[PDB]
Amino acid sequence: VYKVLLLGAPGVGKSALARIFGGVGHTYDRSIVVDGEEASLMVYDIWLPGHCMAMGDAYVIVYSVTDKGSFEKASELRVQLRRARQDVPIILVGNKSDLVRSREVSVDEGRACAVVFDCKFIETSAALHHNVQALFEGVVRQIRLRRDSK
Numbered sequence: 344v345y346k347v348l349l350l351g352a353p354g355v356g357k358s359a360l361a362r363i364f365g366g367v368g369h370t371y372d373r374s375i376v377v378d379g380e381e382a383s384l385m386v387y388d389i390w391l392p393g394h395c396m397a398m399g400d401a402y403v404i405v406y407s408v409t410d411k412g413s414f415e416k417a418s419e420l421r422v423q424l425r426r427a428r429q430d431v432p433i434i435l436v437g438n439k440s441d442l443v444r445s446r447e448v449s450v451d452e453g454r455a456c457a458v459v460f461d462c463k464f465i466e467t468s469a470a471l472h473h474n475v476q477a478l479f480e481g482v483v484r485q486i487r488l489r490r491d492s493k
């Protein structure tokens with residue numbers, strides 16, 4: 344049973360993503376099967392930033408691909424985590440991939456941010472439910488790898 348914190352600037356789709364996962368701040372629970380093994384995830388959509396950051400088994404940092412300011416905020420959030428948790432899995436998410444015409448952050452900028460962070464990167468669309476199940480399965484897989492590389 345794993346606690347997952349959603350972090351990111353206002354308006355990026357944290358609540359959208361969480362409500363889709365929950366099948367529905369606020370909290371969501373849900374058991375899912377990942378590589379043949381059941382896992383429960385508790386998703387905290389609660390973004391006292393220090394307290395929030397002190398608390399997860401994994402961190403999902405969300406920005407909107409339509410909002411370069413939210414992508415900058417993602418880098419700021421990562422620096423903060425580095426100070427707050429001085430091992431934890433982090434997934435970077437570029438949401439709103441359906442809004443092709445208003446895109447402000449390229450896929451390659453997202454990928455580059457992943458290299459700097461040394462973390463996994465995925466783009467999502469809460470509007471289309473695209474990559475939402477993959478995001479949360481990835482969370483589970485990344486937590487397991489870190490339980491086991493020990």
Ligand SMILES: Nc1nc2c(ncn2[C@@H]2O[C@H](COP(=O)(O)OP(=O)(O)O)[C@@H](O)[C@H]2O)c(=O)[nH]1
Pocket residue numbers: 351352353354355356357358359360438439440441442467468469470471
């Ligand atoms: N088109 C589109 N709109 C989205 C997507 N995700 C969130 N939104 C919209 O983005 C705005 C903020 O979403 P919300 O879940 O409240 O974001 P939060 O502030 O990060 O929790 C709302 O207008 C949502 O409908 C997406 O993937 N595609």
Ligand SMILES: [Mg+2]
Pocket residue numbers: 357358359
């Ligand atoms: Mg919200």
